[PDB]
């Protein structure tokens, strides 16, 4: 409640989003999608992320000072 | 020569009566748009050795909100303002128990009276402007958008919106020209109000510092 | 060297690495450059 | 809105740079629904209006209620908005679109 | 007779619609009137401004102290982007006007035209690395 952030995950917040989800993959972090025939760690973050399922919050630090903890199905994704 | 003297004199006053009414203070659309011949008329002479004299061009404005508060325009004849022509002021000042005053200053000013004003800022405001600055209203040019000095209230709104510290804020030189039109002080803030051709229109915030 | 810290931040706001607001808006309406292309007003140029 | 482009741009200028391409956007429309320029329409001049309305609702740059909020996100999407209103007009969307 | 530090005076009529006077007819018509535009080789922007049967809105200057000192901060904004879109458009580029916007604004931003040369980045007030990262580290690593 009483977000002002964008509604939207910005380019870089996805970048950063798969890129750590796909290192906690490749160190054997659970799944949080069923992956069929896919050993890349980039590609079972992105598949995750398209299921919304990337069990990650992004805290976005307001220039005040303040910040907004905002989740990664929350947030729209540009694809 | 003196018609294009008295011409200037037009013109200042001219840009002093649209000062004022930018400042808020209450100037008669008369007053605004009067023309030279106008002003030939209200004086019917020529500046030199004539009815026409820089003590008689003397302006006292009321400030729209405030009737009481009031605002004066000096024209001293001496090319050079002396601290006994500011002290004649000050005490003429004295007597109206007004403030704020516009020294308009001929081609120069005594350095002794520029430390005098402001010896004496903090009980009267004295502004001094020269004449050459005056024969022009800047505010009317193309570059310059529309400035608006923002009521304190205002500020603390612009603040609370924008979560910011009026350091934060992009700044304005207190001797900036238009500061100096608008008479604004330290501390204020101006509203810049701009046409963009990305957005059509812009609003940008200045502190006087 | 002067505008090397200048970001948009996620208040939409422009500021520099001191947080001095630069522009309200990015560009003053907030769009990204990639996006936008030109057009032509209809009604500005034609008679009353 | 006319005034308003005619004090923002003296020259005349009308090229001007906006984030969407309305006119593209309308030929995309009408080969994709097979839109028959010959036949009328069925296209109501108030849902058009009305779109517009809820349209430039939803176009937001500045978010917030206060009136401060209110006059930055008018004049953030002043430009667009008055496009887009030109371009959607029901004239022209009942004339030509 | 006449203004110093003018030396040359060029009286032309301007055949590109920027320098024209473009008016709004009755009919709501732009029309672009031919009118008698003079520049100069010198710069004296007040005295040229008061000056009689000058245009005191249209007229301006190429010297931005000069637009600093006479119309203000704003105004330096203002004229600055026109003069570097002018050098960029001036061989038929175009760069997205936002980028103009944000180097003037930058430039403009303390109230006082900040040069981008280190003369004036230094008068930015940064952090004692940054300070560095711009030049004088040493010393400025000792005086902090």
Same mark, same amino acid.
């Given at each position: 409640?009483?977000?002002?952030?964008?509604?939207?995950?910005?380019?870089?917040?996805?970048?950063?989003?798969?890129?750590?989800?796909?290192?906690?993959?490749?160190?054997?972090?659970?799944?949080?999608?069923?992956?069929?025939?896919?050993?890349?760690?980039?590609?079972?973050?992105?598949?995750?992320?398209?299921?919304?399922?990337?069990?990650?919050?992004?805290?976005?630090?307001?220039?005040?000072?303040?910040?907004?903890?905002?989740?990664?199905?929350?947030?729209?994704?540009?694809? | 020569?003196?018609?294009?003297?008295?011409?200037?004199?037009?013109?200042?006053?001219?840009?002093?009566?649209?000062?004022?009414?930018?400042?808020?203070?209450?100037?008669?659309?008369?007053?605004?748009?009067?023309?030279?011949?106008?002003?030939?008329?209200?004086?019917?002479?020529?500046?030199?050795?004539?009815?026409?004299?820089?003590?008689?061009?003397?302006?006292?404005?009321?400030?729209?909100?405030?009737?009481?508060?009031?605002?004066?325009?000096?024209?001293?004849?001496?090319?050079?303002?002396?601290?006994?022509?500011?002290?004649?002021?000050?005490?003429?000042?004295?007597?109206?128990?007004?403030?704020?005053?516009?020294?308009?200053?001929?081609?120069?000013?005594?350095?002794?009276?520029?430390?005098?004003?402001?010896?004496?800022?903090?009980?009267?405001?004295?502004?001094?402007?020269?004449?050459?600055?005056?024969?022009?209203?800047?505010?009317?040019?193309?570059?310059?958008?529309?400035?608006?000095?923002?009521?304190?209230?205002?500020?603390?709104?612009?603040?609370?919106?924008?979560?910011?510290?009026?350091?934060?804020?992009?700044?304005?030189?207190?001797?900036?020209?238009?500061?100096?039109?608008?008479?604004?002080?330290?501390?204020?803030?101006?509203?810049?109000?701009?046409?963009?051709?990305?957005?059509?229109?812009?609003?940008?915030?200045?502190?006087?510092? | 060297?002067?505008?090397?810290?200048?970001?948009?931040?996620?208040? #939409?706001?422009?500021?520099?690495?001191?947080?001095?607001?630069?522009? &309200?808006?990015?560009?003053?309406?907030?769009? #990204?450059?990639?996006?936008?292309?030109?057009?032509?007003?209809?009604? &500005?140029?034609?008679?009353? | 809105?006319?005034?308003?482009?005619?004090?923002?741009?003296?020259?005349?200028?009308?090229?001007?740079?906006?984030?969407?391409?309305?006119?593209?956007?309308?030929?995309?429309?009408?080969?994709?629904?097979?839109?028959?320029?010959?036949?009328?329409?069925?296209?109501?001049?108030?849902?058009?209006?009305?779109?517009?309305?809820?349209?430039?609702?939803?176009?937001?740059?500045?978010?917030?209620?206060?009136?401060?909020?209110?006059?930055?996100?008018?004049?953030?999407?002043?430009?667009?908005?008055?496009?887009?209103?030109?371009?959607?007009?029901?004239?022209?969307?009942?004339?030509?679109? | 007779?006449?203004?110093?530090?003018?030396?040359?005076?060029?009286?032309?009529?301007?055949?590109?619609?920027?320098?024209?006077?473009?008016?709004?007819?009755?009919?709501?018509?732009?029309?672009?009137?031919?009118?008698?535009?003079?520049?100069?080789?010198?710069?004296?922007?007040?005295?040229?401004?008061?000056?009689?049967?000058?245009?005191?809105?249209?007229?301006?200057?190429?010297?931005?102290?000069?637009?600093?000192?006479?119309?203000?901060?704003?105004?330096?904004?203002?004229?600055?982007?026109?003069?570097?879109?002018?050098?960029?458009?001036?061989?038929?580029?175009?760069?997205?006007?936002?980028?103009?916007?944000?180097?003037?604004?930058?430039?403009?931003?303390?109230?006082?035209?900040?040069?981008?040369?280190?003369?004036?980045?230094?008068?930015?007030?940064?952090?004692?690395?940054?300070?560095?990262?711009?030049?004088?580290?040493?010393?400025?690593?000792?005086?902090?």
């Amino acid at each position: 409640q009483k977000r002002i952030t964008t509604p939207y995950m910005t380019k870089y917040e996805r970048a950063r989003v798969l890129g750590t989800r796909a290192l906690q993959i490749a160190m054997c972090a659970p799944v949080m999608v069923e992956l069929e025939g896919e050993t890349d760690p980039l590609l079972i973050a992105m598949k995750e992320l398209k299921a919304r399922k990337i069990p990650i919050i992004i805290r976005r630090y307001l220039p005040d000072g303040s910040y907004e903890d905002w989740g990664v199905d929350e947030l729209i994704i540009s694809d | 020569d003196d018609e294009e003297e008295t011409y200037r004199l037009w013109k200042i006053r001219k840009t002093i009566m649209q000062l004022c009414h930018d400042r808020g203070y209450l100037v008669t659309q008369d007053e605004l748009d009067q023309t030279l011949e106008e002003f030939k008329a209200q004086f019917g002479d020529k500046p030199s050795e004539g009815r026409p004299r820089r003590t008689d061009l003397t302006v006292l404005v009321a400030h729209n909100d405030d009737p009481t508060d009031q605002m004066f325009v000096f024209f001293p004849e001496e090319p050079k303002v002396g601290i006994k022509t500011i002290k004649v002021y000050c005490q003429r000042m004295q007597e109206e128990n007004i403030t704020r005053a516009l020294i308009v200053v001929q081609q120069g000013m005594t350095p002794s009276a520029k430390q005098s004003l402001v010896d004496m800022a903090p009980k009267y405001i004295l502004e001094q402007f020269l004449q050459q600055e005056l024969l022009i209203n800047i505010t009317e040019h193309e570059l310059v958008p529309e400035h608006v000095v923002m009521t304190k209230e205002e500020v603390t709104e612009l603040l609370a919106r924008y979560k910011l510290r009026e350091n934060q804020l992009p700044r304005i030189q207190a001797g900036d020209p238009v500061a100096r039109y608008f008479g604004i002080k330290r501390g204020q803030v101006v509203k810049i109000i701009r046409p963009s051709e990305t957005a059509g229109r812009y609003i940008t915030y200045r502190l006087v510092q | 060297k002067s505008m090397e810290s200048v970001m948009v931040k996620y208040d #939409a706001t422009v500021r520099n690495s001191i947080n001095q607001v630069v522009q &309200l808006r990015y560009g003053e309406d907030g769009l #990204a450059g990639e996006s936008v292309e030109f057009q032509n007003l209809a009604t &500005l140029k034609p008679s009353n | 809105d006319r005034e308003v482009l005619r004090v923002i741009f003296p020259t005349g200028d009308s090229k001007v740079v906006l984030p969407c391409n309305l006119l593209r956007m309308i030929w995309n429309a009408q080969k994709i629904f097979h839109i028959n320029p010959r036949l009328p329409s069925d296209l109501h001049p108030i849902k058009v209006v009305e779109g517009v309305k809820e349209l430039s609702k939803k176009l937001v740059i500045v978010n917030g209620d206060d009136p401060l909020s209110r006059q930055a996100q008018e004049n953030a999407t002043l430009l667009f908005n008055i496009h887009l209103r030109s371009t959607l007009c029901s004239r022209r969307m009942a004339e030509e679109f | 007779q006449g203004i110093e530090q003018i030396s040359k005076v060029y009286m032309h009529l301007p055949q590109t619609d920027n320098k024209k006077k473009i008016i709004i007819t009755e009919d709501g018509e732009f029309k672009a009137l031919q009118e008698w535009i003079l520049e100069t080789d010198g710069v004296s922007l007040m005295r040229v401004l008061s000056e009689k049967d000058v245009d005191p809105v249209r007229t301006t200057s190429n010297d931005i102290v000069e637009i600093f000192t006479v119309l203000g901060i704003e105004a330096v904004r203002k004229a600055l982007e026109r003069e570097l879109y002018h050098v960029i458009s001036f061989d038929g580029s175009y760069v997205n006007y936002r980028h103009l916007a944000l180097l003037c604004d930058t430039m403009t931003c303390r109230g006082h035209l900040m040069a981008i040369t280190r003369h004036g980045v230094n008068r930015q007030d940064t952090g004692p690395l940054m300070k560095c990262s711009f030049e004088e580290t040493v010393d400025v690593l000792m005086e902090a």
